Design a protein around this ligand. Structure first.
Ligand SMILES: Nc1ncnc2c([C@@H]3O[C@H](CO)[C@@H](O)[C@H]3O)n[nH]c12
Ligand SMILES: Nc1ncnc2c([C@@H]3O[C@H](CO)[C@@H](O)[C@H]3O)n[nH]c12
Ligand SMILES: Nc1ncnc2c([C@@H]3O[C@H](CO)[C@@H](O)[C@H]3O)n[nH]c12
Ligand SMILES: Nc1ncnc2c([C@@H]3O[C@H](CO)[C@@H](O)[C@H]3O)n[nH]c12
Ligand SMILES: Nc1ncnc2c([C@@H]3O[C@H](CO)[C@@H](O)[C@H]3O)n[nH]c12
Ligand SMILES: Nc1ncnc2c([C@@H]3O[C@H](CO)[C@@H](O)[C@H]3O)n[nH]c12
Lengths: 237, 237, 237, 237, 237, 237
C-alpha cells in the first residue's frame, strides 16, 4: 500500500489506463474488461484490474491536474511495478482544422506548470511520450479505421485561465489539444524510468461552434479506449 | 450547473468547507451536519449541504493539487454564490516542534506553482487568507481548547519532490505545513473576489516519516472540522 | 556597534518602530516618547530610545527600499536583541475606495523584488507579518476608534515604475497600498528569526495623483503611530 | 533571395537535409545526389539541389548552434517553400548504454536556450519532430539493418557549459544525445508551420571522453545520410 | 519640488556627485566646493550646490540600495535638468589582486536586482556607464597619479547575503567591487536619457585580511572625489 | 588541437580578429596582413596568422550566433593563448540618429540569450568589453577621421524575433546596434580571463529596412578592419 493507493503489489497490471474521472475508470473496466475487480478506492480514486482479450489490464482515475496525476503515476511505477501508463482523456481544441471528436495522440506535451523546470534545472525539458507506445496507438487506430492526429498537447494548470491570450499562442505553435495532465505524466515517466502516452478526444473547441451528438461523442470516446487497449496488444508483440 | 458541479444556484451554502478527499467531505456531512443532502456527484467529488447549529453549511471535496482545487473553488464562487471557502486538510510537517495531529492555520501560503506568477505578471503575490477568517479560526480553537499555530503553509505541486533540500529551506523559513492547495485557493479567492482560509491537520512528518493511514486521513481529523465550523458562527456575528 | 548602527547592546528596546524617514523617527521620539535619547546618527539614520506609558520603545528610520531597510532590520535583530519590528509609513493607494490618510495593515506583502526568490530557491515566499502583531494592531486601532484595513501591501523596487499596467493588476488583486519595504522586512524577520509588522498611512493616490507634502509625510501621521505604540502594549499582556 | 541565401523560389526542393559542418553539403551532393546543381554560396554555406532515386532533394549546412540554424531554417520555410527539414549531425552521449556510432533520432529536444520561452510566453514548449518523419527514419534505419534509438536530444547553447552537473540530470531524464540545434529547428518548424527531424550519430561520450576514428566516422556518416534519404522516400509513400 | 527633493529648478548644477551617505554629501561640499549652499534636506537626504574651480557642481546623498538611489537620480534628471550623475561610493573587493583603497571605475554593473529585467522585457540589459564619463575619470586619475581599475561592479540588493556562494562567482567573472547602486543608477540613466558613472574605493575585502590606516583610507576617498570633480572639468571641454 | 580548430599552441597570435562571415578571414589576411599563413581549415572556418606593421595578428571567422562564437573564442583563449579578441561585423540600427555605415563600438552588450544567466547564477551579468580596447578603437577611428559611437549592442538569439515590440524597448534604452554575438564573446572573455571587443558597422535599419550597396559596403568594411588593426597597435602602446 501507498499513501494514496490501498492495494498490494501485483494488484495492478503492468499497464494502466487512466482517465481523469474515477467514475470513468469504473465505466472503462465494466465496458471493456472481463472479470474486472476494484483494487483501489482511497479518496474515491477507483482503480480496477481485469483482462482485455486475455491480457491483464488495469484502469484507474488520475484526478484533474499535474499535481494529482503525478502522485498516482509515481506510486504506480515505483510501488506497483507498472511499466506503462496510458492516459485516456478529453481535451479542448484551438486549431480550426481539429474538430470535435478528433482523436489526438500527444507525442509531446507543452505546459505552463513549473514541475519539469524544477526537475530539469530550470531548462526546457521536452515532455514526450514513449515512441513505441505512440507508434502502437497510431497502428491500432489505423486497424480500427479511426483517424488520429499526432502532435503536441498543452497541459494547463488553470482550466480557467486569467490570460486567454495564451490560446492564440497555442494555435500559432500548432498545439492539437489543451488538457491538464500529459506533461506531468511524461515528467514522472522520465523521472522514474517508465513509459507513458496520452491520448485524448476533443470534447470542446476553446474558440468556436461545432455540433455533434452524445451518441457520437460517446462512440468516439470508446474508440479512444479501443485504441489504447489494442495498442497494448501490439506493444506486447 | 457548472462544468464540474451538477448543482443549481442555491444548492450550496455561502460557506463551503473543502477537504481534498471527497470521502472526508462525506464523513464531515454525516458526522457534523444535520439534514445533509448530497448536491454533487460529478467525478465522485462529493458535495453536501446541511446545517450546523442552525447555520447552513456545505462541504465538498476539492481533489489534490492547485489545478484541481482551482476548478472547484472558481465554480463555487462564480456560479453558486459562495463567499467563503474553508479548506480543511492535511499537511506534512518540517519543523521539529510540530507534531502529528497539530492544527495549523495558514495565514499565508508559499508555493512552487506558477499559477500566481501567471496572475501577477511574474512578480511575488503573497497568497494570504482573509484576516477575519483567520481570527475566527484562532478564536474558535481557543474556545474549544485546541492548540493551533498560525503562519505559512507551503503548497507543493509535487508530493514526490525531487528537491529534498527545499525542505531545509522551508524549515529555515518556518513553514508550518506542506500541503498542495492553499496558495491556489488564495489565488482564486483574490482573482474571483471571495474569501478563503486553509486549516490543516499535520498527518505526517516529512523528516521522521511518521504518519497516519488513509482511513485516518478521512475519518479522524475532528478538531480541525470543529474549529472550521465554529469559526463560521463567529464570522456570522 | 554594527556596520550601520553606532550603538551598543541594550541601547535599543526589544521593539523598534521604523518609518522610512529618519526625520519622522525624530518626530515620533519627540512627540510620543518620554525621556527619549538619540542612540544612532550614522548616515543620518536617526534612532531613539525612550518609553511609552512606561514601556521601553525605540524608533529609527530604515531608509527607502528593501535593500536599505534589510540592512537596518538585520542589524537590529542579530546584534541589538530586537524581537519585533513595526514599520510605520506611507503608501500609495490603487483601490478607488481607499482614501488619503487611511490606515492599512499589511498582513502580507507582495513584491517585485528578487530578494525573497533568492532566499526561497526561486519559489514564491508569502511575505507575511506576525499574526499576533497584526491582531494587536487591529485591536489597538479599534480601541482608538481608528478605521484600519488588513490585507496585502505591494513592496515596489521602483517608485517610478515603467510598468504602469501593473497597477491594474495590483488593483485587481486587492492590494491596499504600494510602498517599498514590507516584503523585505518580512523576509528579514523570517530569515533572522524575529517578528515584524508593517502599518502604512495612505499618503498619495496612484490614480488620482492627490497627495500629501513631504512635511506632512514627516510630522502629521499620528493615528498610525498611536496604533503602533498601543499595539505593543497589547502584545506585552 | 533572402538575407542569408542568394537563391530564388523553386531553387530548393521541398525537402532539405542540413549538416552542421558546411563542407558536408558538397559531400552529400556528390556522393548521394544525381545531377546536383549549386543553388547557394552566401557566406560559404554551399547549398545544392539534386535527386535521390528520382526524388528532388536539397542539402545545405546550417552552422553551429540554435541561432544559426534558426536563420537558415526560417528562410527556407518562409521564402523557399521548404516543407521538411532533416538535420543530420553528431551528438555526445551521457547514457552508459548509448555508444559511439549509435544512431539517435530526436523525437523531442530539450534545451537550455531561451528561444522557445521567448516564443511561448515563458512557458514550456515541447520542441518536437514531426511524428511521421520520425517513424520514416526508424523504418528506413531498420531496412538498412541499423537499430536507431528514439527519444530526447538536449540542444545546448554552450558546448563548453560551466554547469558540469547538468550532464547527470540529462542522464537521469534519459537524454539520448547532446547537440546544439534540434530544439531551435523544431521551434522554427512549429512557428512557421513546417516539419522537421534531427538525426544524430553519437560521436563522443560526454564522460568517457573517447572516440572515434575518421573512417568509422565516415562510414557512420554515410549510414545516417542513407537513413535520412530513404526516410524521405518512405514519407512520400 | 518633487516628492523627495524640496528644491526648485536651477538649484542643482547639471552634474551631481552622489555618495550613499548624506553626511558624506555635506563632507564633500564643505571640503571641495566653494560657496556651497544646502538645497535639499527632505528625509535628511542632504544636497548641496557650490562651485569647483569656478564650475557649478552639486552633491547629494542617494541612500543605500537600488530603490533608494533610483528615486533621487530619476527626479534629478527629469525635474532638475541634471545631465550627469557621478556616484562616489565604497565597495567590497572579491579579487585577490584588488586591494583596500584601490579606485574602481564601474564601466558596467552586474546586479541581482530585478529592476532592469522589469525595464528590459526580462532580457539582459548591460547596465553601463557613459563612455565619455569613464574616459574623463580615467584621464583625471592619470593626471593625479592615481591608479584606477575599469571593469564591472556588482550591485547587490542584500548587503547581508543569505547566499555567500555568489562571491566565488563574482570573482570568477572578474567583478572589481561589490556595492549596491551602480546598476540601478545606470538603468535610470538609460531609461531617462542621461549619463552616469560610478566610482568606488575599496573599503573592505569580502574575503581576506589587509591592513591600512584611517588617514590613508580618507586620503584615497578624497582622491576619488578629486577624480570625479576633475573628470567633470575634462568633459566640459 | 581542439575540437573545432586543428592547430597547435603558437599558431595563433595573441590577438585575433573575427568576422561573422568566414569568407572574410581570407580577405582580411590577403588585404591587410603580410606574410600570412593558413593555420586552420576545420569545417571551412579558415584561420590565418600574419603581421600588420610588424605586429603578429590572426584572423578567423566565428560563425553566426552566440553558441558558435562561444566555441571558437573559448578554444582560442584556453588552448591557443589568445589574450584579445576583436569581433568585426555588422549590425542593424534601431535609433533614428544612427545611420547606415556608422561605426559602433560595443562597450556593453545586452542579450536575450540565457548563456550569461547560466554562468552568473540567474542574475544580471553586465557583458562588457575591455575598456582599453574600447578606447583604442575610439582613438584609432578618430585618427582615421571616423567618428565612432560607443554604447550598448543587443546580441539577439533570433535574427527573426517573434517579438516586434522589443525593438522599441531597445531604442528606448539607447541600443546602438543589433547583432548576434557580442554578449556571448564578452561572457566567454570574462569566464576565461581574457579581453574582448566588438566593433560593428551599421548594415541595416531595423525599421526603415533600407540599404546598402556592396561597394559602399566594402569600403566601410575596410574602414572597420583598419580601425580594429590600428586599435591593436595603440593597445601595444
Ligand atoms: N478545454 C480544456 N482545458 C483543460 N482541460 C480540459 C479537459 C480535461 O478534463 C479535465 C478538466 O475538465 C482535465 O482532466 C483535462 O485533462 N477537457 N477539456 C479541457
Ligand atoms: N507531506 C505532504 N506533502 C504534500 N501534501 C500533503 C498533504 C495533503 O494531502 C494531499 C496529498 O496526500 C494533498 O491534498 C495535500 O494538500 N498531506 N501531507 C502532505
Ligand atoms: N506611491 C508610492 N509608491 C511607492 N512607495 C511609496 C511610499 C513609501 O514612501 C517612500 C517613497 O516615497 C518609500 O519608503 C515607500 O515605502 N509612499 N507612497 C508610495
Ligand atoms: N558533445 C556535444 N555537445 C554539443 N554539440 C555537439 C555536436 C554537434 O557538433 C557541433 C559542435 O561541435 C554542433 O553542431 C552540435 O550539434 N557533436 N557533439 C556534441
Ligand atoms: N561589501 C559591500 N557590499 C555591499 N555594499 C557595499 C558598500 C556601499 O556601502 C553601502 C552599504 O554599506 C552601500 O551604499 C554600498 O554601495 N561598501 N562595501 C560594500
Ligand atoms: N539586424 C541584424 N540582426 C541580427 N544580426 C545582424 C548582423 C550580423 O550578421 C549576422 C546575421 O545576419 C550575425 O553574425 C549578426 O551579428 N547584421 N545585421 C543584423
Amino acid at each position: 500500500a501507498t499513501p494514496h493507493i490501498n492495494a498490494e503489489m501485483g494488484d495492478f497490471a503492468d499497464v494502466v489506463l487512466m482517465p481523469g474521472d474515477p467514475l470513468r475508470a469504473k465505466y472503462i473496466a465494466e465496458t471493456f474488461l472481463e472479470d474486472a475487480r476494484e483494487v483501489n478506492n482511497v479518496r474515491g480514486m477507483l482503480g480496477f484490474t481485469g483482462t482485455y482479450k486475455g491480457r491483464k489490464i488495469s484502469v484507474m482515475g488520475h484526478g484533474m491536474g499535474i499535481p494529482s496525476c503525478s502522485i498516482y503515476t509515481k506510486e504506480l511505477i515505483t510501488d506497483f511495478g507498472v511499466k506503462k501508463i496510458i492516459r485516456v482523456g478529453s481535451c479542448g481544441a484551438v486549431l480550426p482544422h481539429v474538430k470535435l471528436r478528433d482523436v489526438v495522440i500527444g507525442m509531446g506535451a507543452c505546459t505552463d506548470s513549473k514541475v519539469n523546470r524544477i526537475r530539469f534545472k530550470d531548462h526546457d525539458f521536452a515532455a514526450i511520450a514513449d515512441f513505441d507506445m505512440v507508434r502502437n496507438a497510431v497502428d491500432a487506430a489505423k486497424a480500427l479505421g479511426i483517424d488520429a492526429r499526432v502532435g503536441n498537447l498543452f497541459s494547463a494548470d488553470l482550466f480557467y485561465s486569467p490570460d486567454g491570450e495564451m490560446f492564440d499562442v497555442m494555435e500559432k505553435y500548432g498545439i492539437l489539444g489543451v488538457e491538464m495532465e500529459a506533461a506531468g505524466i511524461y515528467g514522472v515517466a522520465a523521472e522514474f524510468g517508465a513509459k507513458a502516452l496520452t491520448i485524448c478526444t476533443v470534447s470542446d473547441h476553446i474558440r468556436t461552434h461545432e455540433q455533434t451528438t452524445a451518441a457520437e461523442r460517446q462512440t468516439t470516446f470508446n474508440d479512444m479506449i479501443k485504441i489504447a487497449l489494442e495498442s497494448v496488444l501490439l506493444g506486447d508483440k
